[PDB]
Write a protein that binds this ligand. Sequence first.
Ligand SMILES: CCCCCCCCCCCCCCCCC[C@@H](O)O[C@H](CO[C@H](O)CCCCCCCCCCCCCCC)COP(=O)(O)OCC[N+](C)(C)C
Ligand code: HEC
Ligand code: HEC
Ligand SMILES: CO/C(=C/C(N)=O)[C@H](C)[C@H](/C=C/c1csc(-c2csc([C@@H](C)/C=C/C=C/C(C)C)n2)n1)OC
Lengths: 105, 48, 160, 61, 378, 75, 53, 53
Amino acid sequence: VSASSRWLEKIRKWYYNAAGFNKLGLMRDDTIHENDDVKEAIRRLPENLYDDRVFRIKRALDLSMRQQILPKEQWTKYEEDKSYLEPYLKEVIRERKEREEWAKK
Amino acid sequence: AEPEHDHRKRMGLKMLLMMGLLLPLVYAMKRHKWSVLKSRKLAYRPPK
Amino acid sequence: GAHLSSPLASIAATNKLCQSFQTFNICYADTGLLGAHFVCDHMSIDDMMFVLQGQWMRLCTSATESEVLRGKNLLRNALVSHLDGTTPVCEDIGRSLLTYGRRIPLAEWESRIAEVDARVVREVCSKYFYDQCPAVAGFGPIEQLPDYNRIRSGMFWLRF
Amino acid sequence: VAPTLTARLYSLLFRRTSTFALTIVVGALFFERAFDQGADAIYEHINEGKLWKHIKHKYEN
Amino acid sequence: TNIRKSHPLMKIVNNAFIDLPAPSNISSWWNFGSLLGICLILQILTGLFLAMHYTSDTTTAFSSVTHICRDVNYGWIIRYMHANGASMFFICLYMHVGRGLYYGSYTFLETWNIGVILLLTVMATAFMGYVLPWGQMSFWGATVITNLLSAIPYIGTNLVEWIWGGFSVDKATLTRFFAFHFILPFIIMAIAMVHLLFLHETGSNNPTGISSDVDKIPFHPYYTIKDILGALLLILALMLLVLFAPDLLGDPDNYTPANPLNTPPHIKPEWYFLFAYAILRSIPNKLGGVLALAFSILILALIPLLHTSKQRSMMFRPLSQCLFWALVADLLTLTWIGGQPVEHPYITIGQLASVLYFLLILVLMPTAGTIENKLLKW
Amino acid sequence: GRQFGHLTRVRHVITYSLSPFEQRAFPHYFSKGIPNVLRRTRACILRVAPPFVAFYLVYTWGTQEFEKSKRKNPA
Amino acid sequence: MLTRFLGPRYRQLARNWVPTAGLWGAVGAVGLVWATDWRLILDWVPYINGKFK
Amino acid sequence: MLTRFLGPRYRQLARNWVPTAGLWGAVGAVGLVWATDWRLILDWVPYINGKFK
Ligand SMILES: CCCCCCCCCCCCCCCCC[C@@H](O)O[C@H](CO[C@H](O)CCCCCCCCCCCCCCC)COP(=O)(O)OCC[N+](C)(C)C
Ligand code: HEC
Ligand code: HEC
Ligand SMILES: CO/C(=C/C(N)=O)[C@H](C)[C@H](/C=C/c1csc(-c2csc([C@@H](C)/C=C/C=C/C(C)C)n2)n1)OC
């Protein structure tokens, strides 16, 4: 049992479905606003992941144009949502903050 | 107060008849130009 | 380089627009592929297309008499150079019989070549190129490869 | 309508941008006549006699 | 090689209107930028042809306007094309700013702040514009707005009198307002080209808020033809308004010459000032009223500093979508109330909506973004 | 400003396009468009409509409270 | 400066472009005639008779 | 977004630039006072007495 922590998770699953990037085949990290830290982390991704990212965005911008979504079966499931960028961006912010700390002394 | 009354309404009919001919025709011009994009098929073929 | 007759070849050479280009007339029974293929750097695809399509149109509308002689001359030379030795000729007999149903003798080729003048070129080039839909195939660093509409717009001229 | 009217309109007029233009300008002049008074005639019917053009002969010297 | 690419005039045109890499997926909501440009030019060509027959003095101001409509051949169309184009220019401005908020376009700092300055300038233009006919609404609308500037602490009266050319909205003011209304659309155009310069430095945003570098298409023919179709709709909306209902948006008081003594019962702005008029009238204090009117527009310069969301667009942001339409419906409220007198139901809800405009932008939408981030575990 | 061939790196994506002269401008205009337009509407009605209803009812009450206020009922 | 433009190729180049240059003149003429309402030219046109006396 | 700007270097950076930032304010003040003729401030100036009653 973890009754609260699965309703606090079920709101999230609800929100995710309401956000609807998954309708356009997208993953959460595909929708992030590209600032310097993000642009850096996109830069640091390995070939396979970067290539997969570009395709998703192309397919998303394609549908967004024809004003469509994917069939239901082919949407991104909340569970199957690979948070592939987070560790890269975590490292870039961690690096930046060390700079910002060194700039203080 | 408004002498032009008849003329505007005469012109307004011509405008409506013109737009009724023009609006579907420009839309048709747009669609055919945009069709190259609206039927485009993508395929991703990553290596290995 | 710069002094080459073909305007495309000379503009290609001067401006290094290209690593290589070649025209082709691939024939199948009742159909074919007529056009050019090129290889170039990422930033030169647009200019290569423009210069190519501009030449097709120049030829479609304003082919001049002397360049048509050079074309005929290159073709007589190609035809006679190709038919050198047992292998190329044996190939020509086999293929010809399968396509034309006979061997078309060399004098007939000369006859049919000599008949082409500037008017013939521009009539025939217009028949096949003018305001016709291209088949386009691209590969590699092709971000700068023109959109189909744009390519299709290069298949005619507003001045003509 | 044997090889289609649109096909013969293309080969005769639309092919060259010159004859395409000439067809538009010749067409724009024809159309202006058939539309100006053609739409004025429809404006006549919705105002059958309430216009001065209909009254006219009531006050004539 | 290519003449269209390398000529020091055609090159500049090519890189702005022809070969420009544009996103494949931009909505009909992206049409308003060009439609503004059409509106601006349309106002110039009707404006000039109006300026040719119009006089700037109290004695002849009202009569020259009539002279145009009645005597000048097809002058009545030019006159109403102008008047309706003015507000058509405002619907496009409102669509365009709205789209900027919804889609996170504002993140382009320079291009967005220039747009705010474009707004203030187009509104400073139209306010000076409506005074020119010298109708009752021309005068008293001019009087009501200028008098607000008396509130600025130590500098108060000297400023209002300086803009007045005297002690009231007089002879000097009409002609002076005409000169400023002639020049400002040209300054607008110059500021609009810098607007387009800063923009082309990034290219357009798109409905998703993700970068479109992976799927760019050339501005011609796709957006040439999409803008051609869109302009046809603008002419439809502007011309239905001109050839069927030329005064629907217009106040009848402006059809009687100005009387500096007899003040009308209702003081009704043209619709595009109603939301702002409401915000201003709601606050009792003099200084505070003007500072709230000022804040009502300069607020858009704060919106970027108050982007809280990890995503750019509202497209995948449901809570933010609700908060946005709350802002639109609230602005629809401020509009309707602005066109109403300061009596019982209207004081309260008008004051209430005012607080909501500010609480929504300054607090509510910045909170929605923080929560929306947290729900995605971002 | 940026131009084609300098925008970004993209690998392994084939795109198949057709000429506008080979295809129809309105493939299935009503048989696909109408299913789509309702689908588009249903996607947004719960996000755009509720403040407008809330405005509309404030508008209709507010105006009804305006007139039914200045008239009296006793002396 | 003009002797470079005279020779057999330019003879062919002029002839190749003349049906076109003639048809653009017909465009310009009809175009000017239609736009200004040159009743001088248009009176003699078998349907365009807006001067219907 | 502002916590990055607080630390000993910025304490030194502010102090290093303050005699200057103060003197530019004196420039702006004298500059505004002189340009508008702020007889409020200028009445108390021992030579500038153009209001010579
Ligand atoms: C800026 C403020 C105004 C707002 C305007 C908004 C309203 C929209 C109207 C804007 C005009 C858009 C025109 C519609 C686009 C159609 C494209 C058109 O320009 O045709 C092009 C070519 O232009 C025409 O061919 C030119 C024809 C010229 C006709 C005359 C026009 C009338 C002007 C009169 C001329 C006389 C001068 C006046 C003397 C006083 C390309 O044709 P295309 O679809 O790709 O077909 C290819 C051609 N083929 C068939 C040969 C292969
Ligand atoms: C601060 C609000 C603002 C106002 C007001 C505004 N702009 Fe913009 N404009 C922007 C922003 C931000 C963009 C970027 C939109 C994008 O690409 O999504 C933009 C985009 C555009 C575009 C490109 C097409 C498009 O819609 O994206 C043009 C053109 C335009 N503006 C011109 C104008 C004109 C003309 C005016 C009226 C003088 C003006 N704008 C008023 C902020 C605004
Ligand atoms: C060539 C100078 C000129 C330009 C440019 C100009 N106008 Fe005007 N405008 C006039 C004149 C003159 C009048 C007075 C005649 C009239 O009311 O029709 C006027 C009238 C107006 C009116 C009063 C409308 C009415 O009839 O009730 C408004 C509002 C207005 N203009 C707004 C604008 C806007 C907005 C712009 C574009 C930024 C603009 N104008 C462009 C000269 C100009
Ligand atoms: C001239 O009077 C009127 C004009 C009209 N077009 O409605 C209305 C009848 C009037 C105006 C209302 C109104 C409301 S709100 C406003 C306005 C005018 S000016 C302005 C600011 C935001 C712009 C400042 C620009 C400054 C630059 C010069 C830097 N807001 N005017 O109603 C009292």
